[PDB]
Scaffold this active site. Sequence first.
Site, PDB file in Angstrom:
ATOM      1  N   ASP A 276     133.085 -25.836  48.729  1.00  0.00           N
ATOM      2  CA  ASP A 276     134.184 -24.884  48.525  1.00  0.00           C
ATOM      3  C   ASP A 276     133.649 -23.465  48.314  1.00  0.00           C
ATOM      4  O   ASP A 276     134.066 -22.772  47.403  1.00  0.00           O
ATOM      5  CB  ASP A 276     135.062 -25.312  47.331  1.00  0.00           C
ATOM      6  CG  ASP A 276     136.438 -24.617  47.319  1.00  0.00           C
ATOM      7  OD1 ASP A 276     136.831 -24.025  48.360  1.00  0.00           O
ATOM      8  OD2 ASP A 276     137.129 -24.676  46.267  1.00  0.00           O
TER       9      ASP A 276
ATOM     10  N   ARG B 214     136.477 -16.572  45.654  1.00  0.00           N
ATOM     11  CA  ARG B 214     137.200 -17.011  44.446  1.00  0.00           C
ATOM     12  C   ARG B 214     136.339 -17.936  43.575  1.00  0.00           C
ATOM     13  O   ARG B 214     136.683 -18.187  42.425  1.00  0.00           O
ATOM     14  CB  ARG B 214     138.518 -17.732  44.806  1.00  0.00           C
ATOM     15  CG  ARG B 214     138.294 -18.999  45.652  1.00  0.00           C
ATOM     16  CD  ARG B 214     139.584 -19.697  46.112  1.00  0.00           C
ATOM     17  NE  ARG B 214     139.214 -20.823  46.971  1.00  0.00           N
ATOM     18  CZ  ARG B 214     139.080 -20.727  48.288  1.00  0.00           C
ATOM     19  NH1 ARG B 214     139.346 -19.578  48.901  1.00  0.00           N
ATOM     20  NH2 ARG B 214     138.708 -21.779  48.994  1.00  0.00           N
ATOM     21  N   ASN B 215     135.233 -18.448  44.121  1.00  0.00           N
ATOM     22  CA  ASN B 215     134.352 -19.314  43.346  1.00  0.00           C
ATOM     23  C   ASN B 215     133.066 -18.630  42.929  1.00  0.00           C
ATOM     24  O   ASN B 215     132.158 -19.285  42.416  1.00  0.00           O
ATOM     25  CB  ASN B 215     134.025 -20.590  44.131  1.00  0.00           C
ATOM     26  CG  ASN B 215     135.101 -21.649  43.975  1.00  0.00           C
ATOM     27  OD1 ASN B 215     135.734 -21.742  42.933  1.00  0.00           O
ATOM     28  ND2 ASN B 215     135.313 -22.451  45.015  1.00  0.00           N
TER      29      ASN B 215
END
Length: 291
Positions: free
Chosen positions: A148, A152-153
């Site tokens: 992922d 955003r991570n």
Amino acid sequence: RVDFPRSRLRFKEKLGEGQFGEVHLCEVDSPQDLVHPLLVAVKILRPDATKNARNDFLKEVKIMSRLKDPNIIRLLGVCVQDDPLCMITDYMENGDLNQFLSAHQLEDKAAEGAPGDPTISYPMLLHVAAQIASGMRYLATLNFVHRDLATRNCLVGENFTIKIADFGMSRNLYAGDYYRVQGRAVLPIRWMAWECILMGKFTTASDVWAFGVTLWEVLMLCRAQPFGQLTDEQVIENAGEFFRDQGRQVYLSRPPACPQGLYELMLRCWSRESEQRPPFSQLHRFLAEDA
Ligand SMILES: Nc1ncc(Oc2cccc(CCNC(=O)c3cccc(OC(F)(F)F)c3)c2)cn1
């Protein structure tokens, strides 16, 4: 192996919340004694957490214990002998990278500036991207697949330091980034290699694909969603075009801030053949040495 001394954590601010846990900024006085103060982030399991949530928490700690790199989130300590379960990590004061870049505008300046300043320079974007590539280079040496990767991570600390993390797929803020179907794994389709969308298995080579999209994000200063003018269904059908290989697949366009040379490397991350995608060591060298 002994817990981190729970009593040392002085809680200051609640940084975030999920349905199972909450994250707090804590300060630790006299970090010298631990074999002025240190700020850390802590995730704590809320007392009403289900049996399933506790299991996931303990597995997350184990997974995180593998990862020791300057540009990956680091597990500093744990408190799990007793309750509540506690996970202790680096505090990254400038928050998640997607929100961070979103608040900045591009400027051609020779001043490095501060993360707080309203503008960011193209050299600094390259430096952000290089750090992510360096984190990913490390994960690839462990054959650890992230699955992922996206801005955003990622987290931003002082002096534009970057650490890759993984906050799961449940935050309402980023719900638009995930494709949800009953009984199936939730999928970040706009960041996914075609073979991931069609067959659901992830590899280092698909992490390279996602890095290409993460790079595209950074160079867009996170101003727009990948394939934002297309629906989820069209993004999924695009993976089919990759598989058929009749030259009708489409790619993300070159960001304004992205020179053609770097774009061509970005396009290589999206090669149909997984084996033709650049290794992270080459991606890192290009960003760190070649502008
Ligand atoms: N302000 C601020 N400062 C720091 C902060 O960070 C955290 C705070 C609390 C808890 C965590 C840990 C979350 N779990 C992971 O990140 C995780 C899990 C599995 C695999 C995994 O692999 C990877 F590292 F490769 F990604 C990562 C990070 C957040 N906000």
